[PDB]
């Protein structure tokens, strides 16, 4: 792979990108609009520590921790937002 870099506002996710991230963290957006703020927050979360976005030779995007060599498909914080969605759903019930 190779690290993804921009080189030498546009970074705001689209409503459609937020919808898709919401589904990925377990929200049913049509039924649970009250949870969508977690999707808006989580989609722009920074990569922790020394994690960097990378793309392999087949074009697939993944995350690589250059400090320790760990790799994963999802953003490392996505599991935290999955957990918060479950807690927020229970809190509001």
């Amino acid at each position: 792979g190779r690290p993804l870099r921009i080189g030498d506002e546009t970074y705001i996710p689209s409503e459609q990108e937020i919808l898709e991230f919401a589904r990925e963290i377990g929200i049913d957006p049509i039924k649970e609009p009250e949870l969508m703020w977690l999707a808006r927050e989580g989609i722009v979360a920074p990569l922790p520590g020394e994690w960097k976005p990378c793309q392999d030779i087949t074009g697939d995007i993944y995350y690589f921790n250059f400090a320790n060599g760990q790799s994963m498909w999802d953003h490392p914080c996505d599991e935290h937002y999955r957990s918060l969605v479950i807690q927020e759903r229970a809190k509001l019930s």
Epitope: L4, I6, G7, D8, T10, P13, S14, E17, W51, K52
Partner: nanobody, 122 residues
Framework: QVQLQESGGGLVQPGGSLRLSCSAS????????MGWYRQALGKQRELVAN???????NYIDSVKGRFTISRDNAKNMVYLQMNSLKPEDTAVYFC????????????????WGQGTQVTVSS
């Protein structure tokens, strides 16, 4: 929503030239890393060339110096100029958009066109 539509493929004589185009929708075009990938029948998808927002390019070794990737940011277009085409260039060619959510240390989303066939044949 970033959406890609490739065109310009088809049959081409060995040794010939061909330019592929891709139209991209969405507002994030100028910050995206745009690329061309190809998938030979029965094989994996493989980088052909890409170009990041700042214009840095990477090429797969087998096409370096025969192919050129370019972008027109005002028109939201990506292009692949191909020269000295060979039978092993036969594949479905896909345009790719890798979209950053942060200038550094962020999530990137990956978008694909449907592909256009290139067949290098006498």
């Amino acid at each position: 929503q970033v959406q890609l539509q490739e065109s310009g493929g088809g049959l081409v004589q060995p040794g010939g030239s061909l330019r592929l185009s891709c139209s991209a929708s969405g507002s994030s075009f100028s910050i995206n890393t745009m690329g061309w990938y190809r998938q030979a029948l029965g094989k994996q998808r493989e980088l052909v060339a890409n170009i990041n927002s700042g214009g840095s390019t990477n090429y797969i070794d087998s096409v370096k110096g025969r192919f050129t990737i370019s972008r027109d940011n005002a028109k939201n277009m990506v292009y692949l100029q191909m020269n000295s085409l060979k039978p092993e260039d036969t594949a479905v060619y896909f345009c790719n958009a890798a979209r950053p959510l942060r200038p550094e240390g962020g999530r990137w989303l990956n978008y694909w066109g449907q592909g256009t066939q290139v067949t290098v044949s006498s």
